[PDB]
Design a protein around this ligand. Sequence first.
Ligand SMILES: Cc1ccc(C(=O)O)c(O)c1
Ligand SMILES: [Ca+2]
Ligand SMILES: [Ca+2]
Ligand SMILES: [Ca+2]
Ligand SMILES: [Ca+2]
Length: 435
Amino acid sequence: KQLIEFVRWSPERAQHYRNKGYWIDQPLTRILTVGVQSHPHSLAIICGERQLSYIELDRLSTNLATRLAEKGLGKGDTALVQLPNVAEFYIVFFALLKAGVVVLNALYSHRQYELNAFIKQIQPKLLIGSRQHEVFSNNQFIDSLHDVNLSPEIILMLNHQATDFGLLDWIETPAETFVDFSSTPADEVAFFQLSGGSTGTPKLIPRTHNDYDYSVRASAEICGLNSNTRLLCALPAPHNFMLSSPGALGVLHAGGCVVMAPNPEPLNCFSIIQRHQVNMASLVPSAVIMWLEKAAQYKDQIQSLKLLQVGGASFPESLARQVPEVLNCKLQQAFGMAEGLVNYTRLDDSDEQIFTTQGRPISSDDEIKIVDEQYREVPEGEIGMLATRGPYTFCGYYQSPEHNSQVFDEDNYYYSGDLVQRTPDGNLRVVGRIK
Ligand SMILES: Cc1ccc(C(=O)O)c(O)c1
Ligand SMILES: [Ca+2]
Ligand SMILES: [Ca+2]
Ligand SMILES: [Ca+2]
Ligand SMILES: [Ca+2]
C-alpha cells in the first residue's frame, strides 16, 4: 500500500521548481503518450532488423503492463530487470512506468553478487532477465532466492525455455481480464538509478518522474535533438548517460529514433551507423579511442555522424581535438552523475571551451559549491571538491541514512567526490576524484 520511500526536496524548493517549469508533474510515460499523439508511425527504436514505431512501442508496453496488473503487481511493488541492449529493454521500462512498479535496471555485466545485493535491498516481486545471461543459464541463482525467502512472484525470461514465462509472450499478448493500473505519482519514485564509482555494490538512487523527465527534456534541448535525430545506443541502455543525457529518453522526447548496438565495438557500430544513417552517438573516452583507431579506414561508413557526446572519464584536450578531425563530427563534452547534476558544453561554445572543459549545468537552478578540505569555498579558478543541489539532483540514497549523513551537508548539497575547477568562461573542468 505504501509507495517506495525516498528523501524529498523541501517544499520551498519543490514549489520553485514547479514555478520555473522544471517540474510539470507528468509521469515519464509522457514522452511516449505525446509521441503517439503527434507522430504514431515515426520510428522510435531500430534494433537489428526490427523497427518499432512510437505506437508499436506504446501498444507493446501497455500489453505487458496489463499482464503485470492482472497479476497484482503495481503501486508499492518493485522489479529487477537485467536485459541486454535490445528493444525489449525499453518496452519493459515503459511497461513498469505504466504499471506503477518501481524498477531497478541492473547492468547486463552485473553478476550474482550484485543481483543478490539488489534483490535483498528492494525485495522485488518481479524479475526479468535473459536465459542467455551467465546468471540464468541454469536455475541455481533463481533457486538460491527461495532458500532465503526472497523469490519473486513472477520471473520473465528473454530467450526463455519451455517451462519459463517468455518475456515476448507477455509483451505480444495483452491480459485476458482487465485490472486498472497507473503510474506512481509524478513527485514520487519512478525507478532506481545506480551510483558510479561507489566502493561496494552500486548504491540505489531513487528518481522521481518530475526530476528525471526535467533532466531529459532540458538535455534534449541543449543537445539540439529533433525528430530527425538517430542516436546510436552503444553504451549500456540502463546507464544514466545513455538513458537520459540526453540518451534514448531524450531522443524519444524529441520525436526521433534510437538505434541499438550490442556494445561500442567499432566495426559493428560503424556498420550500424551506415546502415541506418545514425547522426548522433554518445561514448565514454575508452570507446572513443577504439573508434579513433579505425575511423580513417571507414570514413565513408561513419560520414553521417553529426554529433558525439563524450563523458564518463578523463578526456584530455589532445584526444578531444581528434573527434572533429578523424570522426568528422562535432564534439560535445559532458560530465554527469546518476545522482543528478549533468554538465554539457553547449553547441555554440567556443572551440577552446568544447576542447578543454566539460561544460556547465543543465539548469540555471543547479547550485554549485567547490570547496577545500575545510569545506570553505575555494577562490574562483582553484581546484575543489564539488558539492551541488538542484531540480534533478537526488536528496539521498535508498535506505541509507548513515551514508547520506556523510555525503550531504546541512543545506542538502550533495558531495559527489569529483574534483573540479570553474574556468573563467563559467564552464567546469573535471580534474580528479576524492575519497
Ligand atoms: C552526461 C553524463 C555523462 C556521464 C555520466 C556518468 O555517470 O558517468 C552521467 O551520469 C551523465
Ligand atoms: Ca514494426
Ligand atoms: Ca517534440
Ligand atoms: Ca559527419
Ligand atoms: Ca561519484
